Amino acid sequence: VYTGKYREDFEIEVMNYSIEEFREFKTTDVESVLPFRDSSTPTWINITGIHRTDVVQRVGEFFGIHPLVLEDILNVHQRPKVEFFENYVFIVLKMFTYDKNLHELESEQVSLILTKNCVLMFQEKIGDVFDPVRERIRYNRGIIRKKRADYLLYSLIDALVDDYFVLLEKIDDEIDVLEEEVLERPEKETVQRTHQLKRNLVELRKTIWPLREVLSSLYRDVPPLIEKETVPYFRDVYDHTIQIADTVETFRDIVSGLLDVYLSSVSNKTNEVMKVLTIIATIFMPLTFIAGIYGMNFEYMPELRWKWGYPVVLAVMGVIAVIMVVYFKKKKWL
Amino acid sequence: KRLSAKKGLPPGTLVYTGKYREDFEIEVMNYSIEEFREFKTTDVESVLPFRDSSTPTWINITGIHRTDVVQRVGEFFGIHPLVLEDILNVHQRPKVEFFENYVFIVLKMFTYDKNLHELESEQVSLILTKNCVLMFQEKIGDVFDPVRERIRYNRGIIRKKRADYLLYSLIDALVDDYFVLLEKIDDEIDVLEEEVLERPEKETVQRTHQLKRNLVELRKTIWPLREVLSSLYRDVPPLIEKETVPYFRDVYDHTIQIADTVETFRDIVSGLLDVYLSSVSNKTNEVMKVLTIIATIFMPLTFIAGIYGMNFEYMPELRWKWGYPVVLAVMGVIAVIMVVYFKKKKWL
Amino acid sequence: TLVYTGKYREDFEIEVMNYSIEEFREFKTTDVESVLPFRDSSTPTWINITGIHRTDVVQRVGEFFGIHPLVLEDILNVHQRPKVEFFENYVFIVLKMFTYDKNLHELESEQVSLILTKNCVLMFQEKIGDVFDPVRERIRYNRGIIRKKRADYLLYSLIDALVDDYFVLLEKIDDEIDVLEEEVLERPEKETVQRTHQLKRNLVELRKTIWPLREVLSSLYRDVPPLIEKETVPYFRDVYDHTIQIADTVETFRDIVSGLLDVYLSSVSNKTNEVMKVLTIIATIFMPLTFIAGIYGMNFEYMPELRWKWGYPVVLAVMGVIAVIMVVYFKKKKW
Amino acid sequence: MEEKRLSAKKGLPPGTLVYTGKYREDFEIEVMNYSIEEFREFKTTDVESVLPFRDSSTPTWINITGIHRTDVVQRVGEFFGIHPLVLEDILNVHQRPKVEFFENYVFIVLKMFTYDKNLHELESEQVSLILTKNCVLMFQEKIGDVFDPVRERIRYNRGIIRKKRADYLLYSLIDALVDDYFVLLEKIDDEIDVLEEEVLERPEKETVQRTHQLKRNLVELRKTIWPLREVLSSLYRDVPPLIEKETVPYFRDVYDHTIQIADTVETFRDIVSGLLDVYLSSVSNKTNEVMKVLTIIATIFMPLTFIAGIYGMNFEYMPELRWKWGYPVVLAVMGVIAVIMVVYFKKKKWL
Amino acid sequence: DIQMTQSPSSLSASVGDRVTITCRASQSVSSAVAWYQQKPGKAPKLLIYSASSLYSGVPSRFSGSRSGTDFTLTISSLQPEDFATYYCQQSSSSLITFGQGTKVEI
Ligand SMILES: [Mg+2]
Numbered sequence A: 001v002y003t004g005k006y007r008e009d010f011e012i013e014v015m016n017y018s019i020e021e022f023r024e025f026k027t028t029d030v031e032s033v034l035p036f037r038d039s040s041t042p043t044w045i046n047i048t049g050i051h052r053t054d055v056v057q058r059v060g061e062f063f064g065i066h067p068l069v070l071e072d073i074l075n076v077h078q079r080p081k082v083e084f085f086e087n088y089v090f091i092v093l094k095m096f097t098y099d100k101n102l103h104e105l106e107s108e109q110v111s112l113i114l115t116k117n118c119v120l121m122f123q124e125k126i127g128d129v130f131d132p133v134r135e136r137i138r139y140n141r142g143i144i145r146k147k148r149a150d151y152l153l154y155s156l157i158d159a160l161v162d163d164y165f166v167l168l169e170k171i172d173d174e175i176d177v178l179e180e181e182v183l184e185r186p187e188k189e190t191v192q193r194t195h196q197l198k199r200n201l202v203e204l205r206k207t208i209w210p211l212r213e214v215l216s217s218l219y220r221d222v223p224p225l226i227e228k229e230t231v232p233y234f235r236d237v238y239d240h241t242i243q244i245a246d247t248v249e250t251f252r253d254i255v256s257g258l259l260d261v262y263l264s265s266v267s268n269k270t271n272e273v274m275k276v277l278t279i280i281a282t283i284f285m286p287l288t289f290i291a292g293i294y295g296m297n298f299e300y301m302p303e304l305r306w307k308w309g310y311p312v313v314l315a316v317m318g319v320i321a322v323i324m325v326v327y328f329k330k331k332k333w334l
Numbered sequence B: 001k002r003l004s005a006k007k008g009l010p011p012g013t014l015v016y017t018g019k020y021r022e023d024f025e026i027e028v029m030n031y032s033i034e035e036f037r038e039f040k041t042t043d044v045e046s047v048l049p050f051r052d053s054s055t056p057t058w059i060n061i062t063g064i065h066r067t068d069v070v071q072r073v074g075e076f077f078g079i080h081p082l083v084l085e086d087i088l089n090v091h092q093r094p095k096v097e098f099f100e101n102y103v104f105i106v107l108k109m110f111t112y113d114k115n116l117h118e119l120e121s122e123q124v125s126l127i128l129t130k131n132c133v134l135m136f137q138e139k140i141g142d143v144f145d146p147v148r149e150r151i152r153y154n155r156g157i158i159r160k161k162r163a164d165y166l167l168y169s170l171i172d173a174l175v176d177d178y179f180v181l182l183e184k185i186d187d188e189i190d191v192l193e194e195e196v197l198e199r200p201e202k203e204t205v206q207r208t209h210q211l212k213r214n215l216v217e218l219r220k221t222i223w224p225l226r227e228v229l230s231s232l233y234r235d236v237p238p239l240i241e242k243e244t245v246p247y248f249r250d251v252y253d254h255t256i257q258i259a260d261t262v263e264t265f266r267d268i269v270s271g272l273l274d275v276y277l278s279s280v281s282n283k284t285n286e287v288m289k290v291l292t293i294i295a296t297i298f299m300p301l302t303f304i305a306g307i308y309g310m311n312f313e314y315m316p317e318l319r320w321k322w323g324y325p326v327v328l329a330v331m332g333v334i335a336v337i338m339v340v341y342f343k344k345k346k347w348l
Numbered sequence C: 001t002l003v004y005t006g007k008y009r010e011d012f013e014i015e016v017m018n019y020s021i022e023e024f025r026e027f028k029t030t031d032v033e034s035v036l037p038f039r040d041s042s043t044p045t046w047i048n049i050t051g052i053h054r055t056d057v058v059q060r061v062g063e064f065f066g067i068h069p070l071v072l073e074d075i076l077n078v079h080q081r082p083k084v085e086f087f088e089n090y091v092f093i094v095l096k097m098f099t100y101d102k103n104l105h106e107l108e109s110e111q112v113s114l115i116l117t118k119n120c121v122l123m124f125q126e127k128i129g130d131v132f133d134p135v136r137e138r139i140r141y142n143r144g145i146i147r148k149k150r151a152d153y154l155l156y157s158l159i160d161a162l163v164d165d166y167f168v169l170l171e172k173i174d175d176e177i178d179v180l181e182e183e184v185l186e187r188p189e190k191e192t193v194q195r196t197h198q199l200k201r202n203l204v205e206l207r208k209t210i211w212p213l214r215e216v217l218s219s220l221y222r223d224v225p226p227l228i229e230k231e232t233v234p235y236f237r238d239v240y241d242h243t244i245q246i247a248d249t250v251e252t253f254r255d256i257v258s259g260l261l262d263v264y265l266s267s268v269s270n271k272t273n274e275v276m277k278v279l280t281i282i283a284t285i286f287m288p289l290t291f292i293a294g295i296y297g298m299n300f301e302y303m304p305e306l307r308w309k310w311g312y313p314v315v316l317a318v319m320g321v322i323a324v325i326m327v328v329y330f331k332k333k334k335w
Numbered sequence D: 001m002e003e004k005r006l007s008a009k010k011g012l013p014p015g016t017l018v019y020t021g022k023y024r025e026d027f028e029i030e031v032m033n034y035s036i037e038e039f040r041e042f043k044t045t046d047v048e049s050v051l052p053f054r055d056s057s058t059p060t061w062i063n064i065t066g067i068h069r070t071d072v073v074q075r076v077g078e079f080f081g082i083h084p085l086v087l088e089d090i091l092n093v094h095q096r097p098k099v100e101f102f103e104n105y106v107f108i109v110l111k112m113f114t115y116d117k118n119l120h121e122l123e124s125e126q127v128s129l130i131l132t133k134n135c136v137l138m139f140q141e142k143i144g145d146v147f148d149p150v151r152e153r154i155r156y157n158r159g160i161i162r163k164k165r166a167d168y169l170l171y172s173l174i175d176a177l178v179d180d181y182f183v184l185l186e187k188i189d190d191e192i193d194v195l196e197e198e199v200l201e202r203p204e205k206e207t208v209q210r211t212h213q214l215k216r217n218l219v220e221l222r223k224t225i226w227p228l229r230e231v232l233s234s235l236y237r238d239v240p241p242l243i244e245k246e247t248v249p250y251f252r253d254v255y256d257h258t259i260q261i262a263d264t265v266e267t268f269r270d271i272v273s274g275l276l277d278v279y280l281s282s283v284s285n286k287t288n289e290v291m292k293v294l295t296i297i298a299t300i301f302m303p304l305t306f307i308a309g310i311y312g313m314n315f316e317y318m319p320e321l322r323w324k325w326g327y328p329v330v331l332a333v334m335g336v337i338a339v340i341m342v343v344y345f346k347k348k349k350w351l
Numbered sequence E: 001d002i003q004m005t006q007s008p009s010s011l012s013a014s015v016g017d018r019v020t021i022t023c024r025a026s027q028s029v030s031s032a033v034a035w036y037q038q039k040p041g042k043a044p045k046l047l048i049y050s051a052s053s054l055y056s057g058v059p060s061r062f063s064g065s066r067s068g069t070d071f072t073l074t075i076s077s078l079q080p081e082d083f084a085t086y087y088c089q090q091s092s093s094s095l096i097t098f099g100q101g102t103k104v105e106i
């Protein structure tokens, strides 16, 4: 049974390479790829579109693949996993995409199978970060020509892990812009975006941790399918996963306090408004009281008979206003 | 190892530790390839002869308030007294223990009701021995109807093969019907987020904290489900017979996925309290702005109405072109400059 | 196409510094044509175009030196992070310079571009003012080994002077960190918070600038394209190490300023208590007094408001009595 | 990553090895040569008297306290064959735990914490371990450590330690460090308890400052503990030739300890995160009581002044104001409305 | 050439006083400022390094501080054996520069 919500397209791409030359093809007929596995030289087999379970079960039967890992391939919600069998190695990894002006993380599951000298790839969309390895194969760069299919699996996993660094850079930029907005533009859209970023980072924290385990398995177990001498390369990828995990949790540590920063900024703004109200009230209500003292209607009242008494009252009010505002200026409030 | 000693209780008695004391029913399914027999017995004697019967049997005992029945079964079926105490003890965390003859399993059920965001917990316990599955549950209403109708229809490999598939079927049904409740709760929290984005009223705090406590209980339940499935899968006890190791590995992966989901959803929930605090702080800021502007315009105007409203024997009234409209215009001008200042500072 | 992006349109000049193994030639010119024949000379030359708002000059040099039209967009696009691009005939590097004014704590960016073509290097600047005076002195005065070396060493010398000026920037930022730290600890004020926000923004800009620079230097020494040459690799490794130092310092300073912000920021909501205490005490003291003043100032023509025992001073003393009672009621709750 | 070499530092002559710490007071070298036969303890300040112990067959424990003496570290590194970059990492305190494997030795970096009371501070000291054949070199900054139990076991032949080789000594030292991490965690739990009390019972600025200090302490604790988990995992999985095959289960036990420690730190982080919201709610409660006092006063007194103004206007055009009264009505209305407002505040109790 | 000018050029005080000598740098030396004590006819003695750190063996009387480009040396309680000329030094660059001195006298 199929699970992915992606059903638009279906394609197959095959690459065969050796020291002498490389054979790059592309077709849709499943029957053309059957004679490709038996070649001694390493070959790369890629099938796109998991909705059509017929071709999946056909290649599973043809390649001697168990139906259980086929069910795993069809399922998309499965977290990353590695399973070692005598004929073939089954690995599950995810692919992430992030964009600007809109805050969405999309996960495209990619399943890798290593057997003989052929690597099988399963994915949903068209387009992936496996272009640098393709360019290295086709343009005779690096040592990929001199190596076997396990080194091709290394190249694929290395590129997939390397794209995580670019994802982290984009998320760091978004974290920076949110930090600024939280610090000085406190609004509701800010809160919504902070929530969205927190959820996305929790999803990445979910995905990246099993990646460490699935790389450690290829690092340490080394079943005879891994031709050895390539273990240090998997060591490098394991270290890269360590770095990605550290960076991800640093990001989540920042994001946790973003909202507290926002709440304190809102408190600061309402404090400013409160300061304005307090200053005006405390320099005005006492003066209103002073004015009301003289406004009382009594038959006899001392100081109603004084040379320019009303100017003296106004001067007294001016004096008290000046001393109050001087006290506030000392307080730094105004 | 023997029954724990309680201060209030007499030395040996076993006490039910629950709230449900309404119903008592026993369901016994002796399912087999040739045929199956189903019947409900109100008394406990009928289930006893199936202690050593070769054919697998499935005994569903509903109502644990009758401690008599439970300890009669325990004495008859060889269950150790401490296992009986933990069967009665509903206030418990899911766990499994391995013995020489039987496997004891504890794992809980949850039900959800509309308009009342309450998460129940039914203590259902499983006992695996010989070819018998003994089930003790608090109240009528179970989640194992699909397995029962699958046995009755004869469909599936569970009827043809041994009873360890029956235990696996029960556990899989329980984990599966966690998902109906989980889907209901997810729909509820999504719609609740809809209103909290629309209307941040007083009840929102109570509802969000109720959901947070619900998640805390779900985590306290799900985390013990591993180290239970962990023991069942890795430890491969002899009663498993090694035929069902992948049927335990898949449930292991399922439980790990559920634990990861609850770990994510806890932070998802806390974000809701954060958003609610944001909205209430903004509302308080708006109230402050309105009050401050009203007071700020109307207090100097009271200065005018008081200072010139004074009565004095010799006041420089100095009526100039009937200056009372002049003073009114002065108040108007100061009010206009104040509201202009407020607009420029963007408080209003 | 190929329109200048920055905000500088005043300064324009072209400068060539052709140094040889035992000879030296230097001049400043204003016409693009005179510097063109220096492309084919064997001895390395350094060509500087300090005003890139004059687009025609940039097009002329790009067409004369046969560089791809794509690099021209980045040359004229000042708002861009540092980067490096390796092509068959030349390497294109985008870098930046920074100037910090201690009087007004603001950070200004100025883009520069470097193109290494065989036996020459080209430099494009938005305005006048470069951090490359020491390399000019070293070239002119036959000190160091830049005179004995090729144009790749010139690219080295320019990048080394750049990172040295980065160190000079970090010194002034260190001074600002210290002063702001002591202000924030012992003199909480609005100006300190504004300064802290400015400093945090400046450090964010520095981080986003310095990390691409580190990747540029790493690409420069590890990949070692044919124009870089074998002998100059250790020098590029040294500059990579200097960039590592700068990045570590930037992260430390950014952490310090975030920690500075946090304490004051959570110290809010205790200012709310003080402000409301002041407002409540002033309102409680002066509202009932105004009420009674209005009551006894209210006229009705039938009141017992005849003086009897002189009552205006009596009512004022009463005002004082309730005022003192209210103040005594305060400080009981230690407000 | 390619080959490794000393990174060039600007402002320093090339190849210079510099101590990047804060402690300059203490210098001491301890030697503990032990076997099933006898132990030979030794404490000195001469580096030339420990170098012969390189070729000892019996297990040796050399402990050089005080790495501000860069000359001693360089001399030991040259004599023992340690690479200069490992010496640079030894003298680089501003680092995080790591493990490096070479042909002839194992290099490990750990951390020591000492939580202090009456000054809520978590300070760290870097400790380096080099496992060379039969020797275990130890580098420390200041006097004071957590390896007294191992010293007692060596002294009294208690336990298995004296029967085994130097890799068991490395086990024992790492286990002692991880054990003291538990005491550190207990101290920090007590601090969290005290702070969570102080947040509610007396909320002030020092409480939130202490809360932020504790939160950053927890952050650096995690930044330290995670590489510890990684290094123990590497030690019992990669298991280089220097580590014997009989020692791995002990490293497994230490690894499980590290995992438990990490879980404890995560729970502490959650509690400290909630402490901020608790503090904000408490201070808002106090502000609420102040606010309600203000509201009660204003509500009682503003309408009364409004009514006074109503009957205080000299509107002489109408004889309504000229009503023969002994002032019963207006004062009675003010009194009854005031007491009505007061009892209205008694219900929905504000006080 | 970074210039350090410390003041006063001479100080007169008795025991038990809080004697403060301040050093001012023309450029921005980060924190690499040290203080030395020189009784006449003897070599200078290092007291405080890094502008705030007390050297080992120096009495806890002396202290150092820094707020910007200016550094302060404070003796909390002067004693008769703390009467000598005090100097200020910067080591930010490889061309070290000294202050001109300050003679604490009875
Ligand atoms: Mg508020």
Ligand SMILES: [Mg+2]
Pocket (backbone or CB within 6 Å): A295, A296, A297, B309, B310, B311, C297, C298
């Ligand atoms: Mg009147």
Ligand SMILES: [Mg+2]
Pocket (backbone or CB within 6 Å): A288, B302, C290, D305
């Ligand atoms: Mg009034």
